[PDB]
Amino acid sequence: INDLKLTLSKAGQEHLLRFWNELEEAQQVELYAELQAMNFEELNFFFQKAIEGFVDARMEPVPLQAWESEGLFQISQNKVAVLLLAGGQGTRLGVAYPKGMYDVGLPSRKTLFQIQAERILKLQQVAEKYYGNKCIIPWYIMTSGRTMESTKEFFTKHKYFGLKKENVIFFQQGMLPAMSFDGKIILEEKNKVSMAPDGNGGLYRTLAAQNIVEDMEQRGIWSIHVYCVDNILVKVADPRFIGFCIQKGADCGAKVVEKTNPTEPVGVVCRVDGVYQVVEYSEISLATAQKRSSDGRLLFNAGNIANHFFTVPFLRDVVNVYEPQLQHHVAQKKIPYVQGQLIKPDKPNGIKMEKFVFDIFQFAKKFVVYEVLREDEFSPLKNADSQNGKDNPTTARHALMSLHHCWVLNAGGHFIDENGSRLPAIPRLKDANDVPIQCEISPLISYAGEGLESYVADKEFHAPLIIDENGVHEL
Amino acid sequence: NINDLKLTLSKAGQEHLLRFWNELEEAQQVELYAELQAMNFEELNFFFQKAIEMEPVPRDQLQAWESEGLFQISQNKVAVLLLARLGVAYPKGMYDVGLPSRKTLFQIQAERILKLQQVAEKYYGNKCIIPWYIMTSGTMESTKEFFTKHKYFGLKKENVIFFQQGMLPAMSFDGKIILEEKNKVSMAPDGNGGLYRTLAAQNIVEDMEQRGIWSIHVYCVDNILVKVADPRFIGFCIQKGADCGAKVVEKTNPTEPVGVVCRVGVYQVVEYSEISLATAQKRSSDGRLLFNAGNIANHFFTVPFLRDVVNVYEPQLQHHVAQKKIPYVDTQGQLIKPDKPNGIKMEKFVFDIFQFAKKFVVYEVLREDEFSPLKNADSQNGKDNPTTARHALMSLHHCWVLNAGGHFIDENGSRLPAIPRLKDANDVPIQCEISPLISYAGEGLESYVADKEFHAPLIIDENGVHELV
Ligand SMILES: CC(=O)N[C@H]1[C@@H](OP(=O)(O)OP(=O)(O)OC[C@H]2O[C@@H](n3ccc(=O)[nH]c3=O)[C@H](O)[C@@H]2O)O[C@H](CO)[C@H](O)[C@H]1O
Ligand SMILES: CC(=O)N[C@H]1[C@@H](OP(=O)(O)OP(=O)(O)OC[C@H]2O[C@@H](n3ccc(=O)[nH]c3=O)[C@H](O)[C@@H]2O)O[C@H](CO)[C@H](O)[C@H]1O
């Protein structure tokens, strides 16, 4: 401990040992492990530059077959990977397990992870169909908190959903200590430093420290599709988006949906002082949020759907060179703490340092924006049911089923009531007993509405209707 | 009831099984009746009619393999499956070879399992479990009794899974089922290859899947040196991506009774009793035996492979036959111990599944560290007996002490050679025994022995180091 004491004294963090004599050896060793693992010199520096750092006026608006084929070709060449921002405990949904494990009550009861996995396997199959060889889209999954072990167990239980273990790469995001307004690391307990994830922009520090870009390079990957786990409609490894970005020579790309409600909680892609960035929804004034352009659309209408494209060379530069130049954002927090007694604070007593995944768009030499349709591509799981009526399991399950219902109609199929009366595209729900059409199509059958003609063309179905690898089921 | 059974028996040419029915007490009749009704005589005849009717294996990372095996164990992804002449009627697991500790083979195995759980916890930081599947035969109740009395040697009841393999009737050379007693069919276990059928029948692979098991280490009960759930073997098999693996030692004596791993363009073991002397003696240009990969009855199976075995491969396994001297009751009602073999037992062999492996690997180990089987009673042929078994274990642990920096001394305090000369017929080899709870394979001995010296017998256990006096 005299080497540790010295390290702590040099950094001005020697209060971290103040309960040492009150701990049993079991507990002392876990503190020791925690402290020995930290870079106190670096942390003081991060704090100092974060505090030094501690918008609307400078914001300005953002003014196909070949794409899909290009994307499928890149997939077929083993040149595409995906990187999943898997998040931490699903505390915003009222659960401790990560969001990828959430079951929104689809007819199949499939989790978000399973749907995403089946989308990946599907594209591998489609590419093999068009270009003739077996191909691989590796799946890099960044977990946070300490959800990694349970995520691995979940995947193993499900046999990686038909993917191969060797092509799913789990890695866990680092944590930073909470700091007081004086820059002192806060003990949560006598034997425990208070620690927290450093935001999804902690991705970059984590890729660097764990040599993840080097694995992509070894595999020969060129394009990375970064996406958020919470969106049930997400077009994982979307070949149209990948082809778009490849043909534009993008180093970085972002998908957006049209924001139509001023107070929708989406970051807006815009230019600030000439450069591309996402301005977070909690940063803009209501005046900026509500500004309309002459067509009547919102001026800032490019809503960030957390779906990005990076080339591997750009990611390498971000990880090795750029992100280290960015200072952390300060967020004040109520941090539970221990002289002698365990206290829960009624007001913020400390700072969490964080970065966001979109903070490095500013470094892109060729940034591009790809607009998509909300109903086909963006239905996020953000909230518990009944919290605010939006972005919850009910809206998520209904968005997917609505989408699949539309696929069936567009492929020439029809839904009928119990008398064989064909239902409208938009049915009237008038009695307490009426429910929307329940339709669920596995990604193994259809990625984006293609390939349904043998299943549904010129046929009538009574919902609920499930289409999957075992056929067509009317429940 | 009886006139119907008789017709069933008559159709199968087995009606002699009722020979003594007119002399049996009522309760005796009920028991024989229940035995016979459960048998499928058509199938048995079919088994009997079929049953009665090579290329060499082309020949450091040890720590990396061990670490991977420990990681599998730490994730609860490893289980072991125990396959369970000495002149005793009780199962071999209960045999006491006369170690200083007097521990039975079962106890030594149990403590190896407990040890690895602890070692994997030390390595990776979480508590973990290695389920122990124990395949018995119709040994089952005695084995369970024994374990319960010893409180599972410190393991949890719920992680020791006893299951009973099938039995087959002994049959004459003419395919007639043999009566052991006037009201009892002579039954024997169907070979250690009976594992696969039993797995399918009792949904054991479902159980492995439910538990989250990925790798099974299958091993023979009789080897006092057996590295139960050996993390090196498991790790090797994991890194090679094998579905199936077999541990071997180098066979150097042509007539050693070990099966030999070979290719027959697929992997097999050819049992020692099926090889010609010519094949057994053949030597390659380096002077080693051409067929030198001796099967030590230690196998690796992935659970997906066992799933494929249960789903697809298990039905194609063949019965081996062996001529046996089967105790019987003659046509005069006399109990006879036959002067000449009088029938056959049909048996499957556990290694016959290797022909279905797509990624089969062989892992060579050192005999002195890993293989000292208990096959024979002490006087019978000078080999593979309680004496050799006990001395092999004590020699190993002696080597562990020296390798860890300790020394043995004589009664005057003088250092003994690694290989001392025996002085007279009353002299003894160094006696040393180290509990598996202290050391699984020679690790963790520094604090006990490094730069210390010991007068044998030396025991090291959870109560420390003991010079016996
Ligand atoms: C910083 C960020 O990403 N902002 C994006 C976000 O905002 P939004 O503020 O809604 O993001 P969340 O609140 O969904 O995510 C922030 C981070 O919080 C963590 N977390 C969140 C919920 C939870 O139950 N557990 C948990 O650990 C995750 O690490 C996650 O990556 O998604 C939207 C699209 O839907 C926006 O348009 C984006 O600008
Ligand atoms: C078929 C077999 O494995 N042969 C092996 C065997 O022969 P070996 O002829 O000496 O012995 P066995 O076939 O009896 O097999 C030994 C193991 O199988 C178990 N058992 C046996 C019969 C049964 O119906 N059920 C059952 O579980 C025994 O309890 C024991 O644990 O061990 C040697 C190594 O020492 C050989 O190199 C092997 O080729």
Curated annotation (Swiss-Prot), chain B:
Q: Where does UDP-N-acetyl-alpha-D-glucosamine 1 bind?
A: L83, Q165, G191, N192, C220, V221, G259, E271, Y272, N295, F349, K375
* Residues holding UDP-N-acetyl-alpha-D-galactosamine 2: K423
Tissues/organs with expression:
Widely expressed. Expressed at low level in placenta, muscle and liver.
Record key words, sorted: Cytoplasm, Immunity, Innate immunity, Nucleotidyltransferase, Transferase
Catalytic reactions of this protein:
N-acetyl-alpha-D-galactosamine 1-phosphate + UTP + H(+) = UDP-N-acetyl-alpha-D-galactosamine + diphosphate; N-acetyl-alpha-D-glucosamine 1-phosphate + UTP + H(+) = UDP-N-acetyl-alpha-D-glucosamine + diphosphate; 5-diphospho-1D-myo-inositol 1,2,3,4,6-pentakisphosphate + O-phospho-L-seryl-[protein] = O-diphospho-L-seryl-[protein] + 1D-myo-inositol hexakisphosphate
**Listed GO molecular functions?**
identical protein binding; protein serine pyrophosphorylase activity; UDP-N-acetylgalactosamine diphosphorylase activity; UDP-N-acetylglucosamine diphosphorylase activity
At the top of the EC hierarchy, this enzyme's class is transferase
The listed locations are: Cytoplasm, Cytosol
Q: Which CDD domains match?
A: UDPGlcNAc_PPase
Please tell me where UDP-N-acetyl-alpha-D-galactosamine 1 binds in this chain: L83, Q165, G191, N192, C220, V221, G259, E271, Y272, N295, K375
Positions bound to UDP-N-acetyl-alpha-D-glucosamine 2: K423
Q: Which GO terms describe its biological process?
A: antiviral innate immune response; positive regulation of type I interferon production; UDP-N-acetylglucosamine biosynthetic process
Per the record, the pathway is:
Nucleotide-sugar biosynthesis; UDP-N-acetyl-alpha-D-glucosamine biosynthesis; UDP-N-acetyl-alpha-D-glucosamine from N-acetyl-alpha-D-glucosamine 1-phosphate: step 1/1
Q: Which GO terms describe its cellular component?
A: cytosol; nucleoplasm; plasma membrane
Is Magnesium tagged as a keyword?
no
Quaternary structure per UniProt? Monomer and homodimer.
**Which family would the database say this protein is a member of?**
Belongs to the UDPGP type 1 family.
Described function: Catalyzes the last step in biosynthesis of uridine diphosphate-N-acetylglucosamine (UDP-GlcNAc) by converting UTP and glucosamine 1-phosphate (GlcNAc-1-P) to the sugar nucleotide. Also converts UTP and galactosamine 1-phosphate (GalNAc-1-P) into uridine diphosphate-N-acetylgalactosamine (UDP-GalNAc).
Protein name per its UniProtKB record: UDP-N-acetylhexosamine pyrophosphorylase
Q: Which species does the entry assign this protein to?
A: Homo sapiens (Human)
User: What are the top taxonomic ranks of the organism?
Assistant: Eukaryota, Metazoa, Chordata, Craniata, Vertebrata
